[PDB]
Each structure stands twice: as structure tokens, then as C-alpha cells.
Design a protein around this ligand. Sequence first.
Ligand code: HEM
Ligand SMILES: OC[C@H]1O[C@H](O[C@H]2[C@H](O)[C@@H](O)[C@H](OCCCCCC3CCCCC3)O[C@@H]2CO)[C@H](O)[C@@H](O)[C@@H]1O
Ligand SMILES: OC[C@H]1O[C@H](O[C@H]2[C@H](O)[C@@H](O)[C@H](OCCCCCC3CCCCC3)O[C@@H]2CO)[C@H](O)[C@@H](O)[C@@H]1O
Ligand SMILES: Fc1ccc([C@@H]2CCNC[C@H]2COc2ccc3c(c2)OCO3)cc1
Length: 458
Amino acid sequence: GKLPPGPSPLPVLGNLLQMDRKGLLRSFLRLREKYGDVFTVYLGSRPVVVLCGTDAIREALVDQAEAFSGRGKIAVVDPIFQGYGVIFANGERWRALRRFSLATMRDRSVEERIQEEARCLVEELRKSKGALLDNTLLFHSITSNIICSIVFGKRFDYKDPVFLRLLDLFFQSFSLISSFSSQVFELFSGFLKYFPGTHRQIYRNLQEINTFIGQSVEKHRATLDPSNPRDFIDVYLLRMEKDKSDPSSEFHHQNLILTVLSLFFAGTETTSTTLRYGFLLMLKYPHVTERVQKEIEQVIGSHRPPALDDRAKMPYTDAVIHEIQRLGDLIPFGVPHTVTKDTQFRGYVIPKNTEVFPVLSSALHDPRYFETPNTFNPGHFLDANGALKRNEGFMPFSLGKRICLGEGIARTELFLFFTTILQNFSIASPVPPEDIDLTPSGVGNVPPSYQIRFLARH
Ligand code: HEM
Ligand SMILES: OC[C@H]1O[C@H](O[C@H]2[C@H](O)[C@@H](O)[C@H](OCCCCCC3CCCCC3)O[C@@H]2CO)[C@H](O)[C@@H](O)[C@@H]1O
Ligand SMILES: OC[C@H]1O[C@H](O[C@H]2[C@H](O)[C@@H](O)[C@H](OCCCCCC3CCCCC3)O[C@@H]2CO)[C@H](O)[C@@H](O)[C@@H]1O
Ligand SMILES: Fc1ccc([C@@H]2CCNC[C@H]2COc2ccc3c(c2)OCO3)cc1
């Protein structure tokens, strides 16, 4: 057995010279062209196995789900997470935190917090009276507020300057994490960590968030009612007490800080940018947005708030959302995995702990599953009867055991925010549809910034 084929590497520099300067995603797509769907690339001196196309990614993450369930490190944030918290934990630590986190958030429901946030957002947008605005901040705020409501048992006002201060420096961290400079850090951190760069700024920002999280933990502990836990932090503190006699237990303070940080880290920016991309497509394609508001009117009407049960009756809107996520492609080369043991895969052997990237973009644009993969097309998700249809290339949340933990919540946000906004508002912008440019990144693709008006309807 051996590793999947790929370009021969240099000793310190790995496959530096066979990389493309546009970044990792582009580097991977060009190599795929030369080497096939499964290949090995050296990021500095680390071998990394790259998976492209729906079928190879499913063969790994679904057909050998356990083998492929390891988590690989992200150099720019590892000095913060250091293998703690739900995202970056491995083995028994991960299993315990993932089990605990799923059970905890799945119990005012999440749906209800979302409808309340959407109600707050609409009330805020109305105050605009159709003024031009950049919706970036509002979309960061609504999605952060869903996580806040789950973890801290509260939401924050849109104009709260302390919320906004922390929000700003938190979201600044995402742009930085996505930059070319950080991508270079992913390859050569062993050297570059000794010099100034984005990694110090990412570190400082996230540590400052950890400080605030730590203060809210103290405050929760001081006011705790063990009979009536308020939120994720309360429930976790009760688990710490329950496990206090087990010194092997994963429920300690560091896992708590870093699990809370993980939920904001994974659950805010992807959701927010999906919404922002969505509204950019809805300005580019008024006929779609018109059909979505027609379906809203038929199913929901103009008086009551959308509810999640509405989605089953709204295949067209559901299909529009699927297509926004697909074309959005917000995590285009996945989040690194590792194999948890020596692994046979398509006739190659992948040694234990080798890093693997599932290149979700190449599934999202797979021409086997999407007739017009580069064109916005809700028909990709609709059958001949206009009913929603599952699509095997649709894996924006990934697949298998590491599948997005927040998938259910994120989809509920997407549905209720898109539909609650479009129920109450129509949209316009200074840029005619024809000149709207959808090209982003890209460790995470970021849409252009744009101006929009929300025009209150009857
Ligand atoms: C449109 C919005 C979202 C998208 C497309 C998305 C996508 C992803 C992806 C691609 C992964 C990597 C899975 C893998 O390792 O292969 C992931 C992991 C994760 N996601 Fe999401 N996400 C979104 C929103 C959220 C939200 C709202 C939450 C929490 C409320 C969240 C929580 C997490 C967590 C905690 C992990 C680590 C899972 C693990 O390692 O077991 N995500 N998500
Ligand atoms: O002088 C400071 C005053 O502000 C306080 O507000 C608290 C709030 O009660 C408290 O809920 C808040 O917690 C901050 C949690 C950190 C949130 C970080 C996330 C925010 C959303 C985006 C992702 C990151 O911190 C504030 C710190 O001040 C209290 O309102 C006052 O009692 C206090 O006197
Ligand atoms: O990590 C060290 C921290 O120690 C204290 O906080 C601890 C507390 O010392 C520690 O008591 C607490 O664990 C208790 C959590 C739930 C208490 C269980 C109770 C159940 C009812 C019967 C009494 C016990 O965890 C906190 C997490 O920080 C300090 O308050 C913090 O400032 C300090 O950061
Ligand atoms: F589990 C999760 C981990 C990281 C996220 C990030 C959250 C913010 N927006 C970008 C998401 C992906 O970021 C990555 C992707 C691959 C990488 C990378 C960083 O550096 C080199 O290889 C989301 C969920």
C-alpha cells in the first residue's frame, strides 16, 4: 500500500512550486486536473490527501465514516484551540463533547428564538424606510444573537456598543483567517510563528473573546440554579459537578471556554455570509425573488410569521435556499480531517493521522449531479412535479460523523430569516441585475459588499 498520487515534493517546501498563487482551493483544483480525484499534496513537509467530487468524498466520509472521522488542525487557530472544544477535539474527547453539545442545543426552542430574532430584525429594517444600507452587520448580529441566546441565555440589541465592539473584533478574525497570509501560515507556521503577522492578531482577538466568555462563565456559576439551568453554560457546569470524581472526564474549564468559542467560531460567519450571498442573488434574479414571495403569500400569507413547519409546504423557496448554499460554496475546501487509523482507500493506503481535505466545492459544482453547475438554478433541486428533490452532490455541511453540528439550526436560520424578511420587504439596489457580479476568499468564499434597500410592503 501507499499514498495517492501527486506531485513529487521538495524537502522543506513540499509542493510549494506546484501550488497556484490564487490560493489553496485553486491549487487543489489544478492538481485534480493532473492527478485525479484522490491525490497527495505536501503542505510544507506534511502529506495531505485531497478528496474531489461527490463520489470520492462520499466513499470516504460516508462509506468509511469512522476511519475518516478525525479532525486536522488549522494552523492560525490551533494556538487558541490546542485540540480542545468540540471542533478541534479528537477521539474520546470529541465524542463526549459532540454528544453533549447535540443533546444540549436540541432542548423557548431554538426555532422560537429564531422567529423572535427575525421579528427584531424586521422591526429594525422598517426603521430604515428604504434607505440604502450594507446588510453585513445586521446579518452578523442576527446570527451571533442566535448563538448568544443558546450559550448565554440572552440576545443583544443591534446598537449595543459593547456587543458591537466584540462583534467587530470577532468578525475581523474571519477575514484574517481567510487571507492569503494565513494560507501561507497553514504551510509554514513552524517558521512564521516567530514573526509578526495575521496569526498574532487572530490570536489576540480570539483571546479577548475567551476573556469575555470566561467572565460570563463566572457570572453563571455565581447565579446558578441547579434545578433550572438557563443555557448551554449552565448545563455544562452541572456536568462538571456530576463528573467531579472522574479525573479522566473531559468536562473541565478549558473544554468549556473552547466549546463556547467553537459554537461562535463555526456558527456565525458561515450562516451570516450565506444570508448575504442569498440577498445578492435575489437582487441579481428578481424573477426568483418574485416567485419566492408568491409562494410565501400562498402558504403563509402576509399576517402570521413564518414557522419552520412552513418549509415542507414551500418546495420552491426550499430549493432556492439549497441553490444559494450550493453556489455560495462558503467552505470550499472543507475543514481538515485526519484518518483515525491506517486506511485503505481506492487502492491506496493512508497512514493513521494523515490529514485529509474534502473539497466540498468540487461536489457542489459536480456536473454529474447539477446540470448547470456554474449557474443559479433552483431546478437543480426540483422534480418534474415541482416537489423538492434530494441531490447527492449537495453537501455544504459536509457528511459523515463530523457533519456540521449546527446543520439543523443553520437551516432553520436560513429559512426563517429569508422568508421573514421577504414577507415584509421587497428589495432594490443601485446596481442593475445585469451588472451584479457574484464572484468572491477563499478558505471561505466571501461575496462582494453591496448596498440594498428593504422596501416595506403591505
Ligand atoms: C449555512 C451555515 C453553515 C454551514 C454551511 C456550515 C458548515 C460546516 C462545515 C462544512 C463543517 C465541517 C464538517 C467537517 O469536519 O467535515 C462544520 C462543522 C461544524 N459546524 Fe457548521 N456550518 C454552518 C453553520 C453552523 C452553525 C449555526 C453551527 C452551530 C450552531 C455550526 C457548528 C459547527 C460545529 C460545532 C462544527 C464542528 C463539528 C465537529 O467537528 O464534530 N455550524 N460546519
Ligand atoms: O460596565 C460594563 C457593563 O456592561 C455589562 O454588560 C455585560 C453583559 O451583561 C454580558 O452579557 C456581556 O457578555 C459578553 C459575552 C461575549 C459575547 C461574544 C460574542 C458576541 C457576538 C459575536 C460573537 C462573540 O458582557 C458585558 C460586559 O459589560 C452589564 O450590562 C453591566 O452590569 C456592566 O456594568
Ligand atoms: O478555571 C479556574 C476558575 O475557578 C473558578 O471557577 C470555577 C469554580 O471554582 C468551580 O467551582 C466551578 O465548578 C462548579 C460548577 C458547578 C458547581 C457544582 C455545584 C452543584 C451543587 C452543589 C455544589 C456544587 O467551575 C468554575 C469554572 O471557572 C473561578 O471562579 C474562576 O475565576 C477561575 O477561572
Ligand atoms: F469546523 C469548522 C472549522 C472552521 C470553520 C471556519 C469558520 C469561519 N469561516 C471559515 C471556516 C473554514 O475555515 C477553514 C477551512 C480550512 C482551512 C482553514 C480554515 O485554514 C486552512 O484550512 C468552520 C467550521
